[PDB]
Amino acid sequence: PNFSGNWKIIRSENFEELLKVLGVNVMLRKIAVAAASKPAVEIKQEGDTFYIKTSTTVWTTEINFKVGEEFEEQTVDGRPCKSLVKWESENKMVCEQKLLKGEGPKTSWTLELTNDGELIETMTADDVVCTKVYVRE
Numbered sequence: 001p002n003f004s005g006n007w008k009i010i011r012s013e014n015f016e017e018l019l020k021v022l023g024v025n026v027m028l029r030k031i032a033v034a035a036a037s038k039p040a041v042e043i044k045q046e047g048d049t050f051y052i053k054t055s056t057t058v059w060t061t062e063i064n065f066k067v068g069e070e071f072e073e074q075t076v077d078g079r080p081c082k083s084l085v086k087w088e089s090e091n092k093m094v095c096e097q098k099l100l101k102g103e104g105p106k107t108s109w110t111l112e113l114t115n116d117g118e119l120i121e122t123m124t125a126d127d128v129v130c131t132k133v134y135v136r137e
């Protein structure tokens with residue numbers, strides 16, 4: 001299920017509420033939802049080994065994981081945590097995260113390559129769920 005490729009975000013719901021739930025400074029919340037801050041996603045997939053890059057205006061995040069192999073990473077609000085990714089179907093994977101230090105909401109995310117060629121991502125902080133929808137390029 002080649003998640004590989006370069007991804008262009010074309011929709012995003014409930015994102016500010018997610019940040020709000022996580023505790024994100026209001027000023028950062030407002031800049032976070034600007035048409036300028038739209039993230040670009042590059043995924044590089046081979047087997048159970050994944051490389052995903054997320055790039056905004058002045059920041060980038062790189063993660064490297066194997067499905068099943070626990071790894072270190074950051075939440076959405078950038079808190080250090082341990083993560084573990086598993087398959088849900090052929091075209092879906094889900095990742096649960098465990099805060100390294102401190103304690104806050106229960107976070108996670110999922111990734112879903114559809115049949116109409118889209119890539120759906122969800123992110124969850126406790127009750128609240130954010131969906132974002134990507135296309136290739």
Ligand SMILES: *C/C=C(C)/C=C/C=C1/N(C)c2ccccc2C1(C)C
Pocket residue numbers: 012015028031032033037038039056057058059132
């Ligand atoms: C949908 C995902 C979004 C809008 C990602 C936002 C992420 C960031 N990051 C990581 C960042 C770092 C510095 C300054 C601004 C940001 C922004 C809020 C765009």
